[PDB]
Point group: C2
Amino acid sequence: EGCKNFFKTLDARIEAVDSLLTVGLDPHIADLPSPATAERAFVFCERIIRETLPFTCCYKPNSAFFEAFGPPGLQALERVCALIPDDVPILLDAKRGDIGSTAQAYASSAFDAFKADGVTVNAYMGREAVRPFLSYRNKGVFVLVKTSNQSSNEFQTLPVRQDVPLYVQMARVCNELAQECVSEEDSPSTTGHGLRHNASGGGVGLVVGATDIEALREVRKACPDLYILAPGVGAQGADLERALSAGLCKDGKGMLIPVSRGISRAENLAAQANAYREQINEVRRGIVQQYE
Amino acid sequence: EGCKNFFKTLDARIEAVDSLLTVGLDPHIADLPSPATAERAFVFCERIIRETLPFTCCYKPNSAFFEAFGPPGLQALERVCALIPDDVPILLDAKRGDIGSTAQAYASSAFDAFKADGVTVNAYMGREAVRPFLSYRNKGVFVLVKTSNQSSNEFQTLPVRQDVPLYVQMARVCNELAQECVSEEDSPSTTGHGLRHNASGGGVGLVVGATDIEALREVRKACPDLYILAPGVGAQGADLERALSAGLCKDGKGMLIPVSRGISRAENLAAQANAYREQINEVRRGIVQQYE
């Protein structure tokens, strides 16, 4: 079964280990034994995977930290991705964004070379920057909508042309794009969250910071079915219970909570991972119970 | 003299070889001898540099095409960058864009590891995504304003809050950012285009497609001194004479014309490079002559 994908594999993994926890694989030089190397970055990511695997539904390595070591850093990235099991999606956080010809090469890099199951994308340049990634029909493509940082309140929150914030228009385009890539499948869906993904387990995802509760509420309203990657928990001190409440779908899914330092710096990685997992699960229980 | 920078080195190179031609180093698999490899990508870029060097003021390798071959592809990128002389700026077209911590790693990748003199950046996430690159005070940081593709007329041209297009607000932020990073230098400048770059030869650049003449006119008006990288010529059939007229500064500089396939596919690379060089120069003659 070399038919590993993003969303279908994800859903099974989520139900199998009961988790929406995504674990970031970010080898910051400062967190590695001195003197830092690409090899040490590999070991760092290995131990993390080895210990948090039972509580994790998805691994999110961030390309920048590997790129910091040059070619040996990417050599480490490839080895890290190859280390992750076939039943656990790999979301490559590279926030790539360029024109057609060029985006096709970033897509191939992420999927053919690094062998990721999903990838992060920047759509400032419009849909021509997202489609090339979606041609790989079984892959997850997560578009940056409203980010977790402070400066997101500089362009992303600008009123656009009753006016809507730029990030909202971005979400509407993403939803329209999701609908465009599932246009030939029997509609309406027979399971419900039909735009969540396509028959191959591929589809459009959204990146919305957990830090901004309003944004999650607005994005969810524009894109009711799509998955949302919500960075912010731990490091940026985001309110986890309030975030899930705003972004989770009726079925208690449709949202991924990525944590990096929150886990990697912990005395016990495995115990910490589970702590977030359980914490997340307390909220999911409520959401799913209200509608039964 | 290991004091190579972007803008000061650039200006000298521009005057030395009399050119605003930037040569793209984009090894598309389709243009390489079959079966394509990272090694063949290196040779491809080598021959290009070897032949167009005398007419080129800057080399622009696009990271995506190297990333397409995996780690060996980046191993090739590093070798390509190391091949370029000390008097010719290297602009790494990676369109990187992420938060502080992470952007610092992309910066280090581009400068410490790949040893580029400049880099392309995506500011959808605001100024926190650009500053980390600017901490490397002698480097050129080119922000995506209004791109050359079609989909740029999807978000970039949206009216923002007398309303202005998003790309214009993006330019104003870039100019405000340039002014922020040169705030401690004697002002006004003694040479004029003072925000062009800082004392270390570093500074903020702009990426505006040559294809959209109006955009060039608008961006120039918001950012009168800054350099503009204008992709579009050749491949996307942009009007070169009209583009330069809209974006060139009074002194006949402040603009870079990147060409990839236009050159790489030519029967004679060197002759073609010069053809664009001369073509560009005919326009510069006029601009500089009107104000004398």
